[PDB]
């Protein structure tokens, strides 16, 4: 399946969340 990514910021630090 096609990869997936989203945004994950905890009010200060942003992080990229991806899975299979």
Protein backbone atom coordinates (compact mmCIF):
# COMPACT_ATOMS: atom_id res chain seq x y z
CA UNK A 1 0.00 0.00 0.00
CA UNK A 2 0.96 3.68 -0.46
CA UNK A 3 2.91 5.33 2.36
CA UNK A 4 1.13 7.80 4.65
CA UNK A 5 2.38 10.83 6.57
CA UNK A 6 0.81 13.48 8.80
CA UNK A 7 1.63 16.38 11.11
CA UNK A 8 2.27 15.96 14.84
CA UNK A 9 3.08 19.15 16.73
CA UNK A 10 2.84 19.31 20.53
CA UNK A 11 2.51 23.10 20.72
CA UNK A 12 6.18 23.91 20.27
CA UNK A 13 7.84 20.96 18.56
CA UNK A 14 6.59 19.63 15.22
CA UNK A 15 7.04 15.98 14.22
CA UNK A 16 6.21 13.93 11.13
CA UNK A 17 4.09 10.84 11.77
CA UNK A 18 4.10 8.11 9.12
CA UNK A 19 3.17 4.42 9.00
CA UNK A 20 2.45 1.52 6.66
